[PDB]
Amino acid sequence: MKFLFYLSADNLEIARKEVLVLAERYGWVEDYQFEERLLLLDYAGEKFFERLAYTNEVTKIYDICSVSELEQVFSEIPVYDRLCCVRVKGGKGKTALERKLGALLWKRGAKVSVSNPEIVYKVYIQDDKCYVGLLEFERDTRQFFLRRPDRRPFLMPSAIKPKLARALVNLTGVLEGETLLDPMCGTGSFLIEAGLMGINPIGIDFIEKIVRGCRVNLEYYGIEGSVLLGDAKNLPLRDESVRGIATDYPYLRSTKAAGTLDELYSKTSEEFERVLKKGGRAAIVTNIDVESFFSNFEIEMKTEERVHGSLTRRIYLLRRH
Amino acid sequence: MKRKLLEILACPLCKSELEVEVVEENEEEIISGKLVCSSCRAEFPIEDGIPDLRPPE
Ligand SMILES: Nc1ncnc2c1ncn2[C@@H]1O[C@H](C[C@@H](N)CC[C@H](N)C(=O)O)[C@@H](O)[C@H]1O
Ligand SMILES: [Zn+2]
């Protein structure tokens, strides 16, 4: 089956990898292709769309055509008795095209309603290529905003936002009832996103006041998880006990402090590899290049995000091999 | 501290199995007690349902 994933422009690398990681965990991918903000997946298996953070829309594709073949596909595409509408993304004269296509549907007995449709016909127009299908899923953007880190009862500055935190938990490929570990959990950004998706969250932090505040944040969101006082350098956990690791490392504040995080990177690299299950993943956020510390891992993804102009984030997806 | 947590929890030092010495408990979690290793014999306190499993550095 063909699905179009209309991706968020934030980071296309994360957006694409997020879909592909969940698709390989939930089902079976025959093939895929990328074209700017469009990701086409030939897919079978269980739907995972409600979990996606960097995908705005998911459409089940009926046909791919040129602008001139568009009226003919709208003469063939199945019609239903429930209220429908046509939504066009790309090009100019979008509203006029939606009205024109809606009239083609009506000709075959469709009930077109713009106010309360149950079915949405989707047309994506990119470089004289039209992707036609039915809306399967649309992400509620309001949900991440309502979970903004400044809205939690225990607040700390520089928290990872819900959208990036959810994308990173998804990149580990962790499923419902499996364990996701955040060994430098802070206010619990990663723990919250994991818990909301049905994953069992485990948080570790070496400051007592922080583990207490984090536990209050979990209570606040109604999440069942464990928050322990410990050091990420010496994990109080058995070998091969966790499916995924998602974490934000301490950032270097000054170039004068170069090498001070070397021990933390070396110890956690060995500890993450020990504690992860076979083929397990760690999605990590740093502000320095750490390739040399994680040579023991397969680096599946490396992306960058400049945040202040003083801060450039490095985002890695590491796989145990 | 949830009891089901002992299934994946290990000593932060030697990574051996831990034993819980319950002082105060609840229907769903351990409130007060100690965590003792079966190899190192290293002790770790549990206060207000929080185990302090930080190394003794
Ligand atoms: N070795 C460690 N073990 C456990 N928690 C740690 C460790 N180092 C730092 N933390 C905690 O990690 C949290 C902050 C980090 N996630 C990094 C946030 C942010 N990138 C920064 O540079 O501050 C704090 O709550 C720290 O107490
Ligand atoms: Zn021990």
Q: What is the distance between the alpha carbons of residues A190 and A165, in angstroms, rounded to a whole number? A: 5
Minimum-distance ligand 1 atom for the alpha carbon of A214: 25
Which amino acid is it at A90? Answer: G
Q: Is residue B16 a contact partner of residue B40, using CB atoms and an 8 Å limit? A: yes
Method: X-ray
Q: Chain-centre distance of CA A124, in angstroms?
A: 22
Nearest to A177 by CA among A201, A203, A199: A199
- Quick check: CB of A88 below 6 Å from ligand 1? no
Ligand 1 pocket, residue A250 CB under 6 Å: yes
A222/A95 same-domain check: no
Chain B hits for A237, Cβ within 8 Å: 8-10, 15
Q: How many CB atoms lie within 10 A of CB A156?
A: 15
Residue A119: in which H helix or E strand, if any?
strand A119-126
DSSP for A174-186, written as a single string: --TTSEEEETT-T
Phi/psi at A172 (5° precision): -75, -20
Same-domain pairing of A122 and A184? no
Task: Give the amino acid at A300.
Answer: E
CB spacing of A242 vs B8 below 8 angstroms: yes
Half-sphere exposure of A264 (CA within 13 A, CB side): 17
- Residue A228 sits in a domain whose CATH number is 3.40.50.150
In this structure, which amino acid lies at residue B12? P
Nearest to A201 by CA among A229, A235, A164, A227: A227
CATH of the domain at A18: 3.30.2130.30
Of the three residues A94, A111, A138, the one that is the final residue of a domain is: A138
Same structural domain, A154 and A292: yes
Structure tokens at A7: 């991706």
Which tokens hold the place of B26? 């609840």
Instruction: Report how far apart the first and last C-alpha atoms of chain B are (Å, whole number).
Output: 23
Half-sphere exposure of A280 (CA within 13 A, CB side): 21
CA A238/CA B15 separation, integer angstroms: 6
Which secondary structure element, helix H or strand E, spans residue B31, and what is its range? strand B30-37
Pairing of strands A312-320, A297-306: antiparallel
- Please enumerate residues of B whose Cβ is less than 8 A from a Cβ of A: 1-2, 5, 8-13, 15, 18, 44, 48, 50-55
Give the whole-angstrom CA distance, residue A238 versus residue A156: 30
Same domain as A117, residue A170: no
Is A193 touching ligand 1 by the criterion CB < 6 Å?
A: no
The angstrom resolution of this structure is 2.2
* Residues A241/A235, Cβ–Cβ less than 8 Å: no
Question: A90 CB less than 6 Å from ligand 1?
Answer: no
- By CB atoms closer than 10 A (0-12, 13-18, 19+), residue A85 is buried
> CB atoms < 10 A from the CB of A292, how many?
10
Which residue segment(s) compose the domain that A32 sits in? Answer: 2-138
Other CB atoms within a 10 A radius of the CB of residue A117 amount to 17
Burial category of A181 from C-beta neighbours within 10 Å (exposed 0-12, middle 13-18, buried 19 and up): buried
- Looking at the fold, whether A172 and A253 belong to one and the same domain comes out as yes
* A245 CA distance to ligand 2 middle (Å): 24
Q: How far apart are CA A10 and CA A315, in angstroms?
A: 13
Q: Look-up: residue for tokens 């994990």?
A: A235
Tell which of A138, A161, A185 closes a domain.
A138
Beta-carbon count within 10 A of A41 CB: 20
Q: Concatenated DSSP letters for A230-284?
A: -BTTB--B-TT-EEEEEEEPPPPS-GGGTTTTHHHHHHHHHHHHHHEEEEEEEEE
Same domain, yes or no: A112 and A166? no
Q: Is A253 in the same domain as A306?
A: yes
Burial of B40 (0-12, 13-18, 19+ CB in 10 A): middle
Among all chains, which residue has been given the structure tokens 């003792």? B36
Same domain, A147 and A264: yes
**Statement to judge: residues A254 and A267 lie in one domain:** yes
Residues A72 and A169 in one domain: no
SS3 A193: helix
Asked if A118 and A212 sit in the same domain, the reply is no
Beta-carbon separation of B15 and A239 below 8 A: yes
One-letter amino acid at A223 equals I
Domain boundary among A138, A166, A191: A138
* CB within 8 Å of B28: residues ≥ 6 apart: B2
Q: Give the tokens for residue A129.
A: 């290529």
For chain A, how many structural domains are there in total? 2
Find all residues with CB under 8 Å of A80, minimum gap 6, and list them: A110, A119
What do you get for the CA distance between the two ends of chain A, in Å?
31
Show the tokens assigned to A91: 């090009």
Spell out the residues 6+ positions from residue A190 whose beta carbon is closer than 8 angstroms to its own: A160, A165, A168, A169, A180, A182, A201, A203, A246, A247, A248
Query: Do A123 and A224 have their domain in common?
Result: no
Give the closest ligand to the alpha carbon of residue B12: 2
